[PDB]
Amino acid sequence: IVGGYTCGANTVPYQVSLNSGYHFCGGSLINSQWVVSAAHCYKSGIQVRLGEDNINVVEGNEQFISASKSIVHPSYNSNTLNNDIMLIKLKSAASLNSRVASISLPTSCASAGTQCLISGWGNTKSSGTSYPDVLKCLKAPILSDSSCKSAYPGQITSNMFCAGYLEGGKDSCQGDSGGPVVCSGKLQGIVSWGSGCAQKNKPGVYTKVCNYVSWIKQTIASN
Numbered sequence: 071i072v073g074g075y076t077c078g079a080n081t082v083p084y085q086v087s088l089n090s091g092y093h094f095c096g097g098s099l100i101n102s103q104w105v106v107s108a109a110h111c112y113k114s115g116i117q118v119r120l121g122e123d124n125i126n127v128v129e130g131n132e133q134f135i136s137a138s139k140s141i142v143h144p145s146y147n148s149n150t151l152n153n154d155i156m157l158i159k160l161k162s163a164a165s166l167n168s169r170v171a172s173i174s175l176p177t178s179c180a181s182a183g184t185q186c187l188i189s190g191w192g193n194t195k196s197s198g199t200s201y202p203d204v205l206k207c208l209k210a211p212i213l214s215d216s217s218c219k220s221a222y223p224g225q226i227t228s229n230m231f232c233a234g235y236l237e238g239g240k241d242s243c244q245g246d247s248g249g250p251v252v253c254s255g256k257l258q259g260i261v262s263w264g265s266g267c268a269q270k271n272k273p274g275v276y277t278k279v280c281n282y283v284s285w286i287k288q289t290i291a292s293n
């Protein structure tokens with residue numbers, strides 16, 4: 071997250087860290103046994119880390135649970151990033167409490183202008199590289215589909231939305247992908263892609279979660 075703020079320990083209780091020996095992606099806990107992340111975060115040997123603040127220090131509220139199964143969306147296209155969503159089933163149910171909690175799925179899609187919270191452990195610089203140890207947060211509005219398409223001609227599908235600031239300076243960045251975009255207590259987006267970070271006219275692009283609620287619910291109900 072570039073131009074954000076320190077969230078505060080365990081204030082984003084649905085945020086998880088995907089670890090394969092090191093943090094590589096965010097995710098969102100949607101029930102005691104399932105996490106939503108980006109399909110581009112797929113890899114073997116994922117350990118889901120819940121209740122994290124400083125990802126380099128064991129602080130006392132963590133739960134580390136291996137993934138038993140990963141399900142990438144059947145229509146994910148890694149060249150276009152269309153349908154950039156995946157489900158991860160935990161080997162065991164997380165113990166839910168105030169600091170490790172699920173996030174509700176949207177019923178309804180969120181409009182341009184809706185304010186959201188984006189969080190992650192990604193790079194905090196737009197030029198240069200600095201990876202924080204603690205969770206960073208950014209409040210950002212959903213942008214109109216027309217401004218999103220004008221920023222990225224020929225690349226925004228009906229399964230994507232932009233959020234952020236066209237003036238730049240505040241955005242998600244490398245290491246934040248797979249993480250949550252929450253609006254009014256609902257998971258509306260997944261950090262997906264963008265052209266660099268925090269650059270003018272290049273806002274972040276997010277997977278539109280509301281389009282996947284039927285697939286998420288059916289997949290969990292069966293797996």
Ligand SMILES: NCc1ccc(C(=O)N2C[C@@H](n3cc(C4CC4)nn3)C[C@H]2C(=O)NCC(c2ccccc2)c2ccccc2)cc1
Pocket residue numbers: 093094095110111148151192241242243244245246247261262263264265266267268273274275
């Ligand atoms: N400003 C918007 C914006 C927001 C988020 C991103 C972003 O995070 N992004 C952009 C993401 N992404 C993936 C792709 C297509 C190839 C499929 N295009 N864009 C990838 C992630 C990143 O770079 N994360 C660093 C992370 C990694 C995880 C999965 C795949 C690739 C890289 C990594 C790798 C190795 C070690 C540690 C971490 C990029 C831009």
Ligand SMILES: [Ca+2]
Pocket residue numbers: 122123124125126127128129132
């Ligand atoms: Ca920790």
